[PDB]
Write a protein that binds this ligand. Sequence first.
Ligand code: IYB
Ligand code: IYB
Ligand code: IYB
Ligand code: IYB
Lengths: 284, 284, 284, 284
Amino acid sequence: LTFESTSRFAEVDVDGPLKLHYHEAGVGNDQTVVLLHGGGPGAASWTNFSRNIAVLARHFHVLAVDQPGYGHSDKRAEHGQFNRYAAMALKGLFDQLGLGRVPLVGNSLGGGTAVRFALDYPARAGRLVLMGPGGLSINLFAPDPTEGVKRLSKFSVAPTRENLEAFLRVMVYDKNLITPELVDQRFALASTPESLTATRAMGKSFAGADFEAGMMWREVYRLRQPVLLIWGREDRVNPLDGALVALKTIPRAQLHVFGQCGHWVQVEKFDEFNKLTIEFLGGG
Amino acid sequence: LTFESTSRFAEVDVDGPLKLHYHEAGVGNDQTVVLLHGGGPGAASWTNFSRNIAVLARHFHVLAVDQPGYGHSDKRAEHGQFNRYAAMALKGLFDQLGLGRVPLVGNSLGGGTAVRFALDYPARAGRLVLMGPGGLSINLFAPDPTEGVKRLSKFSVAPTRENLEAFLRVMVYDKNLITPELVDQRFALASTPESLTATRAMGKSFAGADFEAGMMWREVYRLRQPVLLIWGREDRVNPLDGALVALKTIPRAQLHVFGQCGHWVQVEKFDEFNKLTIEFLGGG
Amino acid sequence: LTFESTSRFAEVDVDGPLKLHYHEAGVGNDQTVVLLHGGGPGAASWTNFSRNIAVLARHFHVLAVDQPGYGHSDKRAEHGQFNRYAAMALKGLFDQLGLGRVPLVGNSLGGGTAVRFALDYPARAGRLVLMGPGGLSINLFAPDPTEGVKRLSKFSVAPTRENLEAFLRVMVYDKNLITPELVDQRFALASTPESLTATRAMGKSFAGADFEAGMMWREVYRLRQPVLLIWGREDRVNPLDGALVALKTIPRAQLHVFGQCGHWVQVEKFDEFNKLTIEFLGGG
Amino acid sequence: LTFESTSRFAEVDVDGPLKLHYHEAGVGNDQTVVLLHGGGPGAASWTNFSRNIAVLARHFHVLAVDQPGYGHSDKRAEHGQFNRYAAMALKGLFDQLGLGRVPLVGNSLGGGTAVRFALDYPARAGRLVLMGPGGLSINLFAPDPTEGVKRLSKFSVAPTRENLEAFLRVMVYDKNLITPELVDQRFALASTPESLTATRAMGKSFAGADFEAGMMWREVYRLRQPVLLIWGREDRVNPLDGALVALKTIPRAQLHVFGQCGHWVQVEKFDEFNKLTIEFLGGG
Ligand SMILES: *P(=O)(O)OCCCCCCCCCCC
Ligand SMILES: *P(=O)(O)OCCCCCCCCCCC
Ligand SMILES: *P(=O)(O)OCCCCCCCCCCC
Ligand SMILES: *P(=O)(O)OCCCCCCCCCCC
């Protein structure tokens, strides 16, 4: 499996044409699963889920979707609340591809999008696996913005290699995962005019008047499916105290916390994450 | 596998002769694992771990040990802090059977004993799996004693079938697991003079001057092994807020919480519990 | 100041004529404050606030309102979601008395009423003082229903003096406050057909299509006033973990917790409560 | 009251002669209270408590002590665990001044010193008021080191005005409190060779064989006096989740949390802090 071999495009309608890029693997496996990546600058499906797609594609039909504003998906200069925007894009893709009810796997911003989709289109979402998720997290103890969010904002204002490296170092427990090569690759993607347009567009929308759609901790008592919350104990972006309202209020919730793990569970605990996900989604 | 086929006795020395009863299965599997049951009146290894021993014995050499005061182990009228007493008994058994470093699985009181053993004899304890554990739990929000502990104390003072049924109903999320047959079986065992002697002996020791040995939330930062904390979200004996100091301070901690699950994780989520335990202890 | 000297009646329109009983004191004082009592069987304004009304009336114009279903207020057999019902009645009284913007003090169910009032009629509510409040509390760790709520439910089904004393004992840290005289007085009021009809109607009103109106932890991020949350560390009805969403999300929140204090802060810590309330509402 | 009019020196024996600087006020008043300042670079008694000493001196005989390594107290290059070192110095002063049992007020590192003093010399410590305290805090959710501690460590390695201003900005909610004048004054004191030597020595003293002396959350269950914990909801050095073990385990604990308040409660909420402290210590 390569970036190129798995690369697919679809055109959907969200207030006009929207090109989505995604990766497909494990075609012919009985169970489809959709993967939604995190929202750090330069993030995309293939790099976010590199330690996971090959393994999950042994069990499932994997669709790893670049969210709008990321990777090779369209990078519009303006949009509404990001998770509802991305959920509308995903609904478009579900309809185009003829998907019925599909489990979703989402880290951080992608977890927010998975939840918004599961709330707005409840018949179309199956089991959820949510890693350090945004949206349904509310940091009952951590002052907002967190150290992690502050470093993301600093990059947005001053998009330098130094500021991107700083934000990446608070994503992980083992800072040796942040190699000069990773920093170089992410900075090249994050600093394009189009990517900076998408990060400028993103800025407005979470602070805009559409904000209530983002406060999904208010809504997840409505989720009827099993939901597996996965957290790194050392997550400095969406810290562990953000799990508590979702764990309490989602009837069929589970939580798994990994010690010695930051915000990139799917990378830092890739084997344990892969095994939890395979078992939770039914072994495929 | 039956109670009778797996039944074993050993005599160890803890301030004199002490007969321990245990169950053995999976002899010849490379990895030995020790199971330590919860401390509810009438509790013992076989009934506590009935949905687990057969499954774990496919992968591991299982030793399910009746703690002192329970099942067919000696029921002395007096002892020190219960977890250190039970840990000294287990050290005696480890030495008699020639065990080296062995993983421990413990629910509630048995989790306390596993931790006390791992702290006092660190070279002899491997990975720990601790379900709604006592000792290393400290209920940061729940007023003590909890609803669960109060019902246990009420039974001790007034050892009636009605008071035992009341305590068993706050052990589980699905109160239909508390059948008239379970109540009858547990009451027959719990109400013997010898069992009431052991429950009278137990009363003193947690309230005695030896109490600090029980406050294992103060000590678990010393544990060097991986530790899997497992909780029922609806545990009314040792509630979920009791997990937080251990999760923070044990370097290689993990936590798994099951929604729609009380204090008997190994019964109410037996399949998920079995799978977590098998994977965590290395697949055997 | 006596029950009789302070006693007042109003008739307001709440889906038809509704008689409200209240106590008025400190008529000389410029700053009006409304007091809303707890919802335990046989509760009313004068008894709930017996250690507070005289002290507060030195500083403030006190209006202590018997909520619908309690004391000498109307006890309808049918009504909607209780806190919205009680808030509508209070709104009717505000309009009749020509009140503008007024601070509210409420314990438990009265705290829920104060919050519902402050959300539904935001310009009419000033500073809030809320003691072990319902509605904006969500018990992130404690399994629901709590020991306290279960004992209230048991009394509703089996309204005996024994079941009332059992509920009253889990409302305080110092059980000696639950005198035979207090139990006899509360039970004589609680056991009337009119009072029991109200108690059951209040219970049923929390479950139905509009249960969202009770989930005020979703809404209090919108409160613009200073809010003083006051909790007893040992509250077994609305435990301390219920404070966290409100403390995090109300911009001008404060929290005071008293150790060695249960669910009746205004009784158990009356002097500390009186001083906190006088200072917080501006000394009068 | 001026810095100069209140200024006092003592020489105590702490593994050799130790000069202590302190401020004395309210010499007429019967109730003595000791104030212990925070440990940020360039901190001292008079500046830490500039909004408190005059108000408290109306009620109490105030002793505001420059802790070793700060202000005009000796700045040794070598010492043991800092809070035990500072507590031993305070004990020396207690004995010299003929003090019996005296209440202590301490923020952050000073709070840690107050607790270590109250544990090591239990008969000498009265009521405690502890604001965002170190030592008895354990951050159950926040990854350590916190944003605040990391900025202090960065200043220690690179003692620039820019790194001091960055640390000071995460100590308050209202960043306008960090005036150019305050930064210039704190940096001129912090940057001296004597002060930097002390700052580094204090940092190193928390890591070594006796690190247990810093883990005071293990020990405060033994405190018999009333303890008022005071926190800013937005404390980014010692965050609010650090309050929970102390609140649970100190029998006569109270907690006050201020919304829209960081790590300098005594400055940011000076009037509310002064009133809480005067009432809690018995009005004087
Ligand atoms: P995950 O890592 O996707 O979540 C990171 C935080 C997402 C929310 C960001 C809010 C501030 C955005 C600033 C835009 C430059
Ligand atoms: P697990 O279910 O084993 O833990 C139950 C509580 C254990 C501690 C009991 C303390 C009170 C004992 C009363 C003796 C009658
Ligand atoms: P405060 O002590 O007023 O709050 C107690 C709980 C009030 C709501 C109870 C609803 C469920 C139980 C009702 C039984 C009729
Ligand atoms: P308060 O603001 O006094 O507490 C701040 C932290 C004090 C302890 C810091 C230890 C680690 C960093 C030291 C750097 C030299």
